[PDB]
Amino acid sequence: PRAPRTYSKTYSTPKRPYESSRLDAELKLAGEFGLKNKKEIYRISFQLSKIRRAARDLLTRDEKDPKRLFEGNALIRRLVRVGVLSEDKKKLDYVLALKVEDFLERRLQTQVYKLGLAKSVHHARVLITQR
Amino acid sequence: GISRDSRHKRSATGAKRAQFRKKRKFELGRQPANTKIGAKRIHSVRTRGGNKKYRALRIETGNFSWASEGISKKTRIAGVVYHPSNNELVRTNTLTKAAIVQIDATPFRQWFEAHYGQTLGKKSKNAERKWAARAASAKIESSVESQFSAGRLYACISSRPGQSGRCDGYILEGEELAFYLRRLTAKK
Amino acid sequence: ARGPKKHLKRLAAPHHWLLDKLSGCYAPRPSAGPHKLRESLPLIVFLRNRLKYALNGREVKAILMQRHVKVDGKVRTDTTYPAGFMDVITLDATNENFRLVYDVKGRFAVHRITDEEASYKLGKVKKVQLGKKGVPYVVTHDGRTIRYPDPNIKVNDTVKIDLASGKITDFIKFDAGKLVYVTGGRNLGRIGTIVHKERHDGGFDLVHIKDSLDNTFVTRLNNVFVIGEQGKPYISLPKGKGIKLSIAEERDRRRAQQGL
Amino acid sequence: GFPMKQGVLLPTRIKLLLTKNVSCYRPRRDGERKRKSVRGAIVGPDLAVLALVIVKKGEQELEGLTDTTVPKRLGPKRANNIRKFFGLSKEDDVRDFVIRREVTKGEKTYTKAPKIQRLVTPQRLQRKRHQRALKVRNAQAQREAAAEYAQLLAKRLSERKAEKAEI
Amino acid sequence: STELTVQSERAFQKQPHIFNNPKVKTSKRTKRWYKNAGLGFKTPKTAIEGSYIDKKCPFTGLVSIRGKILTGTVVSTKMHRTIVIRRAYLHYIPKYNRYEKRHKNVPVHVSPAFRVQVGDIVTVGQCRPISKTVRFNVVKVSAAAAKANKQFAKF
RNA sequence: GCCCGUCGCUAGUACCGAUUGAAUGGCUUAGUGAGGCCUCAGGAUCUGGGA
RNA sequence: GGACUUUUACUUUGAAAAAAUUAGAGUGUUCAAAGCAGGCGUAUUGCUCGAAUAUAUUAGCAUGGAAUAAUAGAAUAGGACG
RNA sequence: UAUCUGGUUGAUCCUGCCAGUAGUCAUAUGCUUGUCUCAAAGAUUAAGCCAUGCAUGUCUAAGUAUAAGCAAUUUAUACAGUGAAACUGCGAAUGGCUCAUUAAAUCAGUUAUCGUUUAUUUGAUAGUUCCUUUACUACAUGGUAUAACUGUGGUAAUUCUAGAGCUAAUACAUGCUUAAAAUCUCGACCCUUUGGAAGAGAUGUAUUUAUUAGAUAAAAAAUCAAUGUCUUCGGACUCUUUGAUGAUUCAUAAUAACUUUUCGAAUCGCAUGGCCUUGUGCUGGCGAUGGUUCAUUCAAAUUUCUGCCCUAUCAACUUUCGAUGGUAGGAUAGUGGCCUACCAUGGUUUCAACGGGUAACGGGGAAUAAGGGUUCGAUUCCGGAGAGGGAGCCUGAGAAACGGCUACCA
Numbered sequence A: 001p002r003a004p005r006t007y008s009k010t011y012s013t014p015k016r017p018y019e020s021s022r023l024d025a026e027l028k029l030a031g032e033f034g035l036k037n038k039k040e041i042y043r044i045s046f047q048l049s050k051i052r053r054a055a056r057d058l059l060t061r062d063e064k065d066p067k068r069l070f071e072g073n074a075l076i077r078r079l080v081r082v083g084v085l086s087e088d089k090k091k092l093d094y095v096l097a098l099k100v101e102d103f104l105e106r107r108l109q110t111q112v113y114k115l116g117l118a119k120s121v122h123h124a125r126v127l128i129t130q131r
Numbered sequence B: 001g002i003s004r005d006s007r008h009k010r011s012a013t014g015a016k017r018a019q020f021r022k023k024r025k026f027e028l029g030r031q032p033a034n035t036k037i038g039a040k041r042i043h044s045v046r047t048r049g050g051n052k053k054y055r056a057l058r059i060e061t062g063n064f065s066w067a068s069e070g071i072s073k074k075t076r077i078a079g080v081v082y083h084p085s086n087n088e089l090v091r092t093n094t095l096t097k098a099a100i101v102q103i104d105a106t107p108f109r110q111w112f113e114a115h116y117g118q119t120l121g122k123k124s125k126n127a128e129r130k131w132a133a134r135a136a137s138a139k140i141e142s143s144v145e146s147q148f149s150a151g152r153l154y155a156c157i158s159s160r161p162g163q164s165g166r167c168d169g170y171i172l173e174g175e176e177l178a179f180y181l182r183r184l185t186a187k188k
Numbered sequence C: 001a002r003g004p005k006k007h008l009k010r011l012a013a014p015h016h017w018l019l020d021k022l023s024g025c026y027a028p029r030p031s032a033g034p035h036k037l038r039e040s041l042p043l044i045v046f047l048r049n050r051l052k053y054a055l056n057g058r059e060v061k062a063i064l065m066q067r068h069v070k071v072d073g074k075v076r077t078d079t080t081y082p083a084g085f086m087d088v089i090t091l092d093a094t095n096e097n098f099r100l101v102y103d104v105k106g107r108f109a110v111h112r113i114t115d116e117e118a119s120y121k122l123g124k125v126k127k128v129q130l131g132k133k134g135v136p137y138v139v140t141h142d143g144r145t146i147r148y149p150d151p152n153i154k155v156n157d158t159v160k161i162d163l164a165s166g167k168i169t170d171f172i173k174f175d176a177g178k179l180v181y182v183t184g185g186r187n188l189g190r191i192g193t194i195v196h197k198e199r200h201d202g203g204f205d206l207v208h209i210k211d212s213l214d215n216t217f218v219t220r221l222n223n224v225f226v227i228g229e230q231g232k233p234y235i236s237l238p239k240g241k242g243i244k245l246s247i248a249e250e251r252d253r254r255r256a257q258q259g260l
Numbered sequence D: 001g002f003p004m005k006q007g008v009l010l011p012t013r014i015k016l017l018l019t020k021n022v023s024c025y026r027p028r029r030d031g032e033r034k035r036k037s038v039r040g041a042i043v044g045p046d047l048a049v050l051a052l053v054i055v056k057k058g059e060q061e062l063e064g065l066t067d068t069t070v071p072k073r074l075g076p077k078r079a080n081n082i083r084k085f086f087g088l089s090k091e092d093d094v095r096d097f098v099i100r101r102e103v104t105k106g107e108k109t110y111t112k113a114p115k116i117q118r119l120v121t122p123q124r125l126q127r128k129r130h131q132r133a134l135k136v137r138n139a140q141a142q143r144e145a146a147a148e149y150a151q152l153l154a155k156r157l158s159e160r161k162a163e164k165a166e167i
Numbered sequence E: 001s002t003e004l005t006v007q008s009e010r011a012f013q014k015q016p017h018i019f020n021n022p023k024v025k026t027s028k029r030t031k032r033w034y035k036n037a038g039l040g041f042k043t044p045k046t047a048i049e050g051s052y053i054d055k056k057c058p059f060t061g062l063v064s065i066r067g068k069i070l071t072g073t074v075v076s077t078k079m080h081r082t083i084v085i086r087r088a089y090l091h092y093i094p095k096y097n098r099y100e101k102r103h104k105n106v107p108v109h110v111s112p113a114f115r116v117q118v119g120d121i122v123t124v125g126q127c128r129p130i131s132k133t134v135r136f137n138v139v140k141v142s143a144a145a146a147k148a149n150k151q152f153a154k155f
Numbered sequence F: 001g002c003c004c005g006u007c008g009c010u011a012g013u014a015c016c017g018a019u020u021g022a023a024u025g026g027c028u029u030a031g032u033g034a035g036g037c038c039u040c041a042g043g044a045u046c047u048g049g050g051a
Numbered sequence G: 001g002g003a004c005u006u007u008u009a010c011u012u013u014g015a016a017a018a019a020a021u022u023a024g025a026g027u028g029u030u031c032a033a034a035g036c037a038g039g040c041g042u043a044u045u046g047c048u049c050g051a052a053u054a055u056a057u058u059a060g061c062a063u064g065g066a067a068u069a070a071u072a073g074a075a076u077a078g079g080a081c082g
Numbered sequence H: 001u002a003u004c005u006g007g008u009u010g011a012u013c014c015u016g017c018c019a020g021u022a023g024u025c026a027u028a029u030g031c032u033u034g035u036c037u038c039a040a041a042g043a044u045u046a047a048g049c050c051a052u053g054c055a056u057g058u059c060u061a062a063g064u065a066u067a068a069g070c071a072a073u074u075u076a077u078a079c080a081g082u083g084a085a086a087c088u089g090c091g092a093a094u095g096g097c098u099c100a101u102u103a104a105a106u107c108a109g110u111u112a113u114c115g116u117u118u119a120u121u122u123g124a125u126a127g128u129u130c131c132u133u134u135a136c137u138a139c140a141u142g143g144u145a146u147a148a149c150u151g152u153g154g155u156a157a158u159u160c161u162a163g164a165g166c167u168a169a170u171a172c173a174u175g176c177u178u179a180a181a182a183u184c185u186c187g188a189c190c191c192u193u194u195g196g197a198a199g200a201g202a203u204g205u206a207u208u209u210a211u212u213a214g215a216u217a218a219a220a221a222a223u224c225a226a227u228g229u230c231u232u233c234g235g236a237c238u239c240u241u242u243g244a245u246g247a248u249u250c251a252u253a254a255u256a257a258c259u260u261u262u263c264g265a266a267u268c269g270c271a272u273g274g275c276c277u278u279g280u281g282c283u284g285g286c287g288a289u290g291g292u293u294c295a296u297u298c299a300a301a302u303u304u305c306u307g308c309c310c311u312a313u314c315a316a317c318u319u320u321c322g323a324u325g326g327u328a329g330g331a332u333a334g335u336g337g338c339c340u341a342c343c344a345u346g347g348u349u350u351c352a353a354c355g356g357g358u359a360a361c362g363g364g365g366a367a368u369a370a371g372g373g374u375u376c377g378a379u380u381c382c383g384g385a386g387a388g389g390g391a392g393c394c395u396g397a398g399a400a401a402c403g404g405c406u407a408c409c410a
């Protein structure tokens, strides 16, 4: 008798277990952004996956439908907020585009490296977890 | 206890039902008063929510209304005479609602002869006045007046003795009296 | 199940209280009183969750047992006493008066009112019967009985009540075009006039309502509480004035007041 | 050790349903009844003890019985009971007849009396006075409210008769 | 139903508390009480004109109509003073996005103010439990005979 | 080349089957019938007809 | 207020509608799953935004539509209006 | 978030299934295991069985204190502080647990009570109680009988208790009271009219019955019986009063009586004040607890409409010993075949009744992501049911209660 603590998982795993292209594709990302997991990519794919779903849906509603206008605007401003969605391409048909790398580019890991300050994605890992 | 649920009992389709829950006291019933005549005996039963019912068993007087005369009087209850539900009720003289009784006449006689100065069947100043005002209003009714000569008046219990401890009713009259006189002799 | 239920599982609590999910398990159960369980605001809730005066429930009993808080004129010392819409809550110390009256989101708002207005209230008359010995009485939504009302007073009219005394000092008929507060349903909190009444013999008259933004909606009679004239309310309304804005309109307001 | 029970008749044991207010049982709870063994009221050699109650003294003195004597624990506490245990009429005033029990606190002897009850007092008379007052005062206030309405109703009639004479 | 006799019981049939004083010489023998059931259901003349008793009559009796007001069609008139109606309705079954004919039979009281016959559409108003099965009372006949006389003999 | 059935071996499953076979569970006739409740009585005792 | 009304399906809009879950807005729990918080100052006697919205369908209720599909009508005239 | 691959042939295209693949608030097991936060957990099988401990008790200034209890001071020779025990009151019907039963049942959404009960909370609500009505009734206040206790006891043994002696009340049981007025019945008289009258009783609330009012669909007349108010004595009656609902025999009131007569304060705490004829007179402050009736609130009980999984190797079912309806009663809080008596022959069914299965509590919901679907829900919230099995019942507003009793079975 206490309200459920709610939860949910934050990743999804590839249906095809051993696809060699997807595996090379994944590894390259890991070796670019200092990841340790295929899950750190699995996670983002999943984040993207819903964002796109939302956007697909919104798109089916009439132009300037209240929900579409309200909930689309919200999602766009949330994405521009963190630097995933460019200023020009600010109208959700491009959030319908939007790649995994656009997301990985904005992790504190990378930002800590992008303006020197670490000079290797991995030096960037170690610094961060070390206060 | 006696239970008043519907959940025993077959369904309109004729289906047998499972036992769903045990008896609760809020569907309870109790046994009949089967109230009889004579010498007051009343027990109270504690009913739902605080609350009393009074279970008359044995009764000998009731309060009886002569509707057309607009008065009521308390009389002895002579006895039961006809019952539409069960003839055993008559044979045993059980008092219930709808029972046909005979009562006493003498309280109703005394009133009538004092109020009309007429006497059924067969000198003050203001009294004379009041009587002379009345009449053209004292012309009774054959089938009621004849009863007085026997000292006994047919009446229908209109209360519920098992419920209220009262055995009350009204004198039979007109059509309703016609009806039971017929039954009485056309079964006598 | 054998008798009167005596607890209230938090989650089964009404939502317009705005209790949190965790931190506990139960919510307070409104004592019996003038207002129904699910359309009430227990003192505990008001003294702690809105006014923030108490932190504990323990300190609510402490505040209350010194007879600090008094409702509708009278003192009241029940932690979970059922306060409700139109009632008046007073803190003599802190020199503060309150009226319980709704948001636009359907909640009970914290609403400071002046000391004078703090000495009367409005009552929807809920029934008008002939009582024993021929004395006619009215009954208002907060369960007051008032003997000898005005013969013109009928059910659904609102009524201005002294408080200091028991008596009525004015009433307002349920007519086409009178200021209305909506107390129940989705449109809980909305305010606006009355366009017209749908009849429907044998169940639920409908009251068509328009506000001061030329916006329209409907509720069951039941949910309609007369409170004055187009313009003239008979009590002060909370800020917002019961108008309800779209989520867009409310977004734009909130992000219009942005520059510190 | 089972007790006898007046009126069973019988000279053995039986098990009875006992209730509130009865020998050989003390209910633990409202409406509790317990089935319990009981010994009959006829004496046989199976008894461990008889209980006897001297009704007439004999030709000689029983030791620790006739020759010793034990005072009642408590005295009359209720007003009129003090009256009767001294025979006093309602004139004597009780407070001086109430019993007082001495008791030593080392080198201080104390004196504690009951607390008379149903004692007629000023404070009681004050509360009798008040009640009688409220009834009447209310009652008078209750016609007034009726009369004020009867007016309101009557001078409504004279507005629906002056309206019926306007048009 | 009723028909004939009216006084055909062990118990004398009367409307309660509707006293007719024998002393007062009236010209209609029995004083009769009736009411307007409400919702604009005309209390038919056969009830006011009537002499039948029936304490379950919506117009001359001790019941009341309140709650559901359903219509259905008469399917059995074997019970003395009560009938059975069939209420058809199509029940929507989502997965197939189509419907199936269903029905329910419903027992209802029928005042001898009415002359119902199998085939009539009848409007019934809910009342208090009147018997084990019956929660409804025929309140108006939205029918007649369904063209009975128009099948008679030859030319 | 493929291939059918009887006959013989090992192992497994289910069927039939004297035992008017056996077990569990739900209802249930007839007979016996605790207990409390209600009721006709009773009256240890104990009061002013009543407990 | 009276006096009387062929009967259905379908569709629309709306009322009545528990929270939690779900979808989803706002908010940088250090991130996040969460939570419903929180955010500004004179941080010495206080100011302030919230705690949305959507879905909730079968049935019942209330309103608009009159296509599609049923039902009923006047022929032994016991037809219609006055 | 609309994807498939391996396996039949010599090779081929098919059909088709087996296998692979991915998720699972989906359980187990194995191996391995450092940190943060979060945190389910004897449901599945056996609603099988349970050692021991705990899970229900409770006191305000304000019901009861002579503890032979503690405390002393502080005005207290009735009591007065504090307070064990005990009586009284309230609570133990909530909560917590489980999922055996249960398939039109429960449950959901939606209804109904003009079909009832309702401790409590809240707001209203009570001038009437006696009596052949001058030698008058305790109201400045009526009765005992009990716990605790003291003391004599019993039994191996329990929250076993007996005999004897005390004493309380907001326990038990009794029992007085208050203004004026009007309306009714009676009626000593007196006098004949058109007729009038002193004075006598009755009329709180509740209970039970009978009777009446509770108008209103637009307007008018005559007559019979009783009989009101005003005569400019042939006559007139003029103004005439009416609540709610869709609907009532509704709310409310009036008449005649009824009742082993319900309620109408014999209670408690603080303050002690006015007033003059100086009675310890007569008044009198704030609020506690109670009290009948109505309303309200927390409820409850029934209840309308529609909606359940598999099954025909279940087709007819229902009245034995109620099945379906009618009348009357009885019983209930109350409707109702709920039960009984009389009477009738009804009620359901291929639009699947009835029966069987369920390793079935129902719902909010969960899992699976093109869509349509498929599968699951013992389990944090709502509803229901149960306490080893059955039944019975005491108390009480509320239980057919099991951390209550009684009986049977185990």
Ligand SMILES: [Mg+2]
Residues within 6 Å of the ligand: B031, B032, B033, B034, F039
């Ligand atoms: Mg009996």
Ligand SMILES: [Mg+2]
Residues within 6 Å of the ligand: C028, C029, C030, C031, C080
């Ligand atoms: Mg509470």
Ligand SMILES: [Mg+2]
Residues within 6 Å of the ligand: none
């Ligand atoms: Mg209604």
Ligand SMILES: [Mg+2]
Residues within 6 Å of the ligand: D117, D118, D119
């Ligand atoms: Mg006292």
Ligand SMILES: [Mg+2]
Residues within 6 Å of the ligand: E078, E079, E080, H325, H344, H345, H346
């Ligand atoms: Mg029949």
Ligand SMILES: [Mg+2]
Residues within 6 Å of the ligand: none
């Ligand atoms: Mg809709």
Ligand SMILES: [Mg+2]
Residues within 6 Å of the ligand: none
């Ligand atoms: Mg929500």
Ligand SMILES: [Mg+2]
Residues within 6 Å of the ligand: H007
């Ligand atoms: Mg192969």
Ligand SMILES: [Mg+2]
Residues within 6 Å of the ligand: none
């Ligand atoms: Mg091969």
Ligand SMILES: [Mg+2]
Residues within 6 Å of the ligand: H010
């Ligand atoms: Mg080859």
Ligand SMILES: [Mg+2]
Residues within 6 Å of the ligand: none
């Ligand atoms: Mg497979």
Ligand SMILES: [Mg+2]
Residues within 6 Å of the ligand: none
């Ligand atoms: Mg288990």
Ligand SMILES: [Mg+2]
Residues within 6 Å of the ligand: H043
């Ligand atoms: Mg479990």
Ligand SMILES: [Mg+2]
Residues within 6 Å of the ligand: none
């Ligand atoms: Mg096993």
Ligand SMILES: [Mg+2]
Residues within 6 Å of the ligand: none
């Ligand atoms: Mg002391």
Ligand SMILES: [Mg+2]
Residues within 6 Å of the ligand: none
């Ligand atoms: Mg529970």
